[PDB]
Symmetry: D2
Subunit: 247 residues, 4 copies
């Protein structure tokens, strides 16, 4: 497929319901050689199973909250893939407390800190650590949400974290482009499995999107077919965002 | 390929350098079956040639300035492709006088009318005419330019026509989505074959995008791989638009 | 007030409910000297009457569909005001059949042409005709609607016309900037006096904006207080546009 | 003036060159009652002087890095102003090492933490603290920059923090709107005093904005004249942002 010959590190696979699983499958379907990371020991077995299914042996633990963990993981990785072609960053977190009720009341300095650190900085931290291992024509990709652009009830601080992320994309595309590295994001709509009857009613295509839809777009965005696209945030929400007062 | 089994009508092929030729070429490469239109008596020959180069015998005349020409064209195509699934709109024009010098001094009522008529209305005109022939999961695509979003010297009235066009994409996407049709646009950067060294020094990827770059993105957007995307204006300009003050 | 010593032309006053009446009032309150246009002879006496309340006796007829009517209006106006400080463009029109139902079905070539011509071209047509009469420090202002940025049911082809208009604002701002003229737009939210319950429910400030809200904004934009703002589309919709899924 | 009757707290006056100085001055001029804050001991002197200069005896210390200092500052302010009408947030910081060269090589986890903490969280942190003291009709305002929207060389991590800020503005506006509070930002262009040759040449108004221009917009935005504007980022850069390829 259009990714054959590409070596992509995939991040954030927690379940087969997870957006990253969908991204992995599509990428694998298109011919990519994949690597996986997992946050904690509890996840390892699971990740290992999926990886095999997808023809992979490369399963490394990585906690993006710690710079060491990051450096370690990419040292191990270089033993198998001394050069590779990018990675998919599908990681986000904010303390659940932050995610309910009045934003002004909910928000805290630490909650603010963590959300931003995990949800946005980790992206550039990862890029910082593997910069010399990336091949010309590599592509990095993260996942975002409408919440970065508009105020959405309860999304609260995550919204701010996502806005920081989408700016990280532009600053990374600008810095890394001259070395043949592309950086994009996908702003995904809400996914039925992983309000919605509102979303479906109002989304132009009249359905919510699927991990498959998201996965297909991600594959395209990490392949050479999208070589003229960098620093972009692509909406994969079935047009949900460009419609208004859809009675 | 990812377009196997799709019938796509391509408009505005007028030369081999043309953006539309790059689009036709990539689609063909991905398995699509093509049909072509040509504006006037003059081009028939060349177009007949290119078509044949891309395995097509469907070459029909179409002058978007006229309602009957479009209706007639679709009547003809329907003899051959009673159902199809989508069309690429790569048409635009402003009288040359409109395009040089101070925007306010250059613009005229007639130059304005025409620019908007051919460059923007024509897109919905075609949709309107083949609406019943479109298969569920069809995709419509048009071509745009940064001038729609920023004031660009000399782009003048064309900047206004492209803005209108971008809105058209949104309005069309919202109207046709419920029936299974997607509508998007590509905002392409300057193309070399088709200042350039400033543009390159300032584009993150450091080069101008090519008609291949554009054709590849177009193919994706017209394929089911992009089922989750509608009403979107995708920038294929190497990240030029998201940078500022680069030097 | 902050408009004292400024001479401003106001178009589109048809009633006391009209946004332009609202704007005229507020500007007059801040000390501007006003002049008015009216479209047809039927409107004449009502306008003369309002103008009188606002200390003006300059009431000229003007149909923006006619170049000649514009030129004639400014000729006449030049007799009293050989030099002035800007105008307020508050005119938009689309054949009513255009504004009901599925956009693709309702839109026609003539409807599209008219909507664009009256609603967008008229803005630059007026600028072009009075360019030499503007003082350094002048300001031009037009009115837009969220429909230019998102697909709104029934707004249909007016959406494309507002989009062409917002781009017209950027191209004019760029062309006229160097001679001391600023150009901007206000994107006004729905006005109760000009669904609304859903609107109020979802607007952050929890009420619809008023023509007073709009007028005060227009007044600021036309004053030297906004000297650092040109080419902008300012949203006066109480934050309606920056929120999502508030329902 | 149009601010007569209001009590506004002003942060970040560090000099007479400060954008914060230009705002206070303008606000003072429009008849507002001012209070001031200062970061540390060294400033007190300067600050106490400007305040005097603007008829204020209210000078309180505040280090936004600490929730403690903020709570206290407002405790103290409630002694003189038990209720007040909003504040202007003119605070930004990132370590200097962060702001030089390749963003990817420059950024650090700590440097990113600080920048977001001081430049973005501080804003909602103050709102949270004085929420109870705000009169209906209050207005909060913050200062931004183009770096939040586009990738600007050397602006680096500040661009991500400004992006977070602009989203904060939307979430704060959506949350506080229902109790009568409006929240907005100004995105100011580069200011000469406090390349510029480049900028001027390419800024539609052909000059860089001044602290007075910014101050005038801020005053309007904090007054009741702008009661219809909330959740908005107004660009006060002479239109710099909306032009492109300006030859
Ligand atoms: N769920 C949706 O509707 C939706 C819509 C748009 C975008 N997204 C985005 O996709 C990503 C999350 O994926 P998802 O929504 O499929 O859910 P998910 O729960 O499967 O994804 C989160 C993943 O992040 C990992 N993670 C969290 N903190 C980590 C840390 N410190 N170190 C290492 N890994 C860590 C978890 O282990 C997990 O696998 C985010 O970027 C989110 O904004 C989700
Ligand atoms: N040139 C650039 O840098 C650039 C960048 C982005 C977008 N574009 C877009 O590309 C398309 C133009 O194709 P291109 O750039 O390959 O070359 P081009 O400038 O030759 O495209 C114009 C095409 O429109 C056709 N056309 C014009 N008037 C017509 C009429 N009345 N009826 C029927 N067909 C008519 C012409 O025959 C021709 O094929 C447009 O969609 C334009 O917006 C150009
Ligand atoms: N009503 C709303 O909720 C809203 C919201 C945002 C923007 N606006 C905009 O404000 C302007 C109109 O004001 P309004 O909406 O208060 O209602 P309106 O119906 O009173 O505005 C239209 C005005 O345009 C004038 N006009 C139309 N065709 C003309 C022609 N050929 N020559 C000269 N004058 C002509 C009319 O005489 C009239 O005064 C438009 O630009 C419209 O898009 C309205
Ligand atoms: N410099 C420009 O051309 C420009 C253009 C647009 C926007 N801005 C914005 O205006 C604001 C600052 O104005 P500026 O750039 O003229 O001056 P600046 O860069 O000196 O602003 C920093 C100010 O923040 C204060 N500050 C820093 N850390 C603090 C802390 N821990 N607690 C309390 N106060 C602290 C300082 O005392 C100082 O007054 C920022 O929000 C910035 O982004 C500046």
């Amino acid at each position: 497929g259009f990714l054959s010959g590409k070596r992509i590190l995939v991040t954030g696979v927690a379940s087969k319901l997870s957006i990253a699983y969908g991204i992995a499958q599509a990428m694998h379907r298109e011919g990519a050689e994949l690597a996986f990371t997992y946050q904690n020991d509890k996840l390892k077995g699971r990740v290992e199973e999926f990886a095999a299914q997808l023809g992979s042996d490369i399963v490394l633990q990585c906690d993006v909250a710690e710079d060491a963990s990051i450096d370690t993981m990419f040292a191990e990785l270089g033993k198998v893939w001394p050069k590779f072609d990018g990675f998919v960053h599908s990681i986000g977190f904010a303390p659940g407390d932050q995610l309910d009720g009045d934003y002004v009341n909910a928000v805290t300095r630490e909650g603010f800190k963590i959300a931003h650190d995990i949800s946005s900085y980790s992206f550039v931290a990862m890029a910082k650590a593997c910069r010399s291992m990336l091949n010309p024509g590599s592509a990095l990709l993260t996942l975002s949400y409408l919440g970065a652009e508009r105020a959405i009830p309860n999304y609260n601080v995550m919204g701010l974290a996502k806005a920081s992320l989408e700016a990280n994309v532009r600053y990374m595309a600008n810095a890394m482009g001259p070395e043949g590295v592309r950086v994009n994001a996908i702003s995904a709509g809400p996914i039925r499995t992983l309000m919605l009857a509102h979303c479906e009613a109002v989304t132009p295509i009249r359905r919510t999107v699927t991990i498959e839809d998201v996965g297909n777009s991600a594959a395209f965005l990490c392949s050479d077919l999208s070589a003229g696209i960098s620093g972009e945030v692509v909406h994969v929400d079935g047009g949900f965002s460009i419609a208004a007062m859809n009675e």
